Design a protein around this ligand. Structure first.
Ligand SMILES: [Mg+2]
Length: 364
């Protein structure tokens, strides 16, 4: 006997450029927690249902997890775009969802069954603008790009634009693109002609990486910030040496000294031969929330005896009250499922000259 927890992430499509990191973190969590006896001796079982890259696929994954796989709760989906459409399905069904990477404004407000461990754009994004200004205090002109078809990108760009204004900078253009675009020559040239000192990009990974490369090809020599959708080493293949110097805010640090982060980090580095990425740490934290909540519930009300609909509702109620020492730091939730998290960082892509290898360097 095991306790089924659903994992609904983008395992296919270009959205898997983010999702694959999340799968890695979730698998590390499953082993970590099961090696500690699961839920008071009862192992968990992660049941993966691929969402692919769109809303329909996410709805299907959620419905399969809820109805066929009988899961006690869901971790997912990868994108805020998907969450706004699919999470209401789980809300209506009274099945908890813990978002591992959904940072758009309004996610926890979807309902009483929706929480997230991923700190939102309003608290993560501004630090990268501040970091750019530290590296070049003479930045004056800023060009902004965003993916107009993606809910998170639209939410993030609003924060970046407000931050630019509040820092007393000139917003010289806001250019739109689609996450499915590969060619940005007209928007990039439009922006370059305005002589920006800083360019900010809110998109996902393939698109964001292609845009970074093209800006550099077209002769842009100023600073670049990428938003959360570019926050993966999977961009390195796309922009190669031309990824160098991109600043990306972080809601996780490998060097955070919390005991469980040390364990998570060691497990990650031993397997993948590099530092754990944010999305992996966040996925681990989401699984952790479920395991620790299940343990607390089971101690008070043995879960093997609770029928599934009540188990789901009691698990949701429990998880919202918990305090968790996770790889992200000490976190908890507000009464509507927003994450409470203190520490944020900025990292910078450092590519080797040949362009075949790179890393994220954390700024002090
Ligand atoms: Mg909520």
């Amino acid at each position: 006997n095991t306790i089924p927890i659903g994992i609904a992430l983008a395992q296919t499509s270009n959205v898997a450029l983010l999702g694959q990191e999340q799968v890695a973190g979730a698998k590390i969590a499953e082993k970590y927690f099961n090696d500690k006896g699961g839920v008071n001796g009862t192992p968990i079982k992660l049941i993966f249902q691929d969402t692919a890259g769109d809303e329909a696929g996410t709805i299907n994954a959620f419905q399969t997890l809820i109805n066929k796989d009988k899961v006690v709760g869901i971790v997912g989906p990868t994108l805020s775009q998907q969450a706004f459409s699919a999470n209401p399905i789980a809300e209506r069904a009274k099945v908890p969802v813990v978002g591992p990477s959904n940072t758009a404004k309004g996610i926890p407000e979807i309902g009483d069954y929706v929480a997230r461990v991923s700190a939102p754009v309003s608290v993560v994004a501004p630090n990268s603008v501040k970091a750019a200004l530290k590296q070049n205090p003479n930045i004056k002109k800023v060009a902004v790009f965003f993916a107009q078809n993606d809910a998170f990108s639209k939410s993030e760009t609003e924060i970046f634009q407000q931050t630019v204004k509040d820092q007393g900078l000139e917003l010289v253009t806001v250019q739109k693109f689609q996450t499915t675009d590969t060619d940005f020559q007209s928007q990039a040239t439009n922006a370059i002609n305005l002589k920006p000192d800083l360019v900010i990009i809110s998109g996902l990974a393939a698109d964001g990486g292609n845009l970074v490369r093209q800006l550099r090809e077209l002769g842009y020599q100023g600073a670049i910030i990428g938003g959360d959708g570019l926050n993966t080493s999977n961009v390195f293949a796309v922009c190669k040496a031309l990824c160098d110097g991109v600043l990306i805010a972080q809601a996780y640090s490998p060097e955070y000294t919390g005991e469980i982060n040390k364990a998570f980090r060691q497990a990650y580095v031993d397997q993948y031969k590099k530092e754990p990425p944010q999305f992996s740490a966040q996925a681990f934290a989401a699984v952790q929330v479920y395991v620790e909540s299940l343990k607390a519930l089971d101690t008070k009300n043995k879960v093997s005896k609770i029928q599934l609909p009540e188990l789901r509702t009691e698990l949701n109620k429990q998880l919202l009250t918990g305090k968790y020492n996770t790889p992200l730091g000490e976190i908890s939730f507000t009464p509507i499922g927003e994450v409470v998290q203190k520490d944020f960082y900025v990292a910078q892509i450092k590519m080797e000259k040949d362009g075949s290898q790179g890393k994220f360097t954390f700024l002090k």
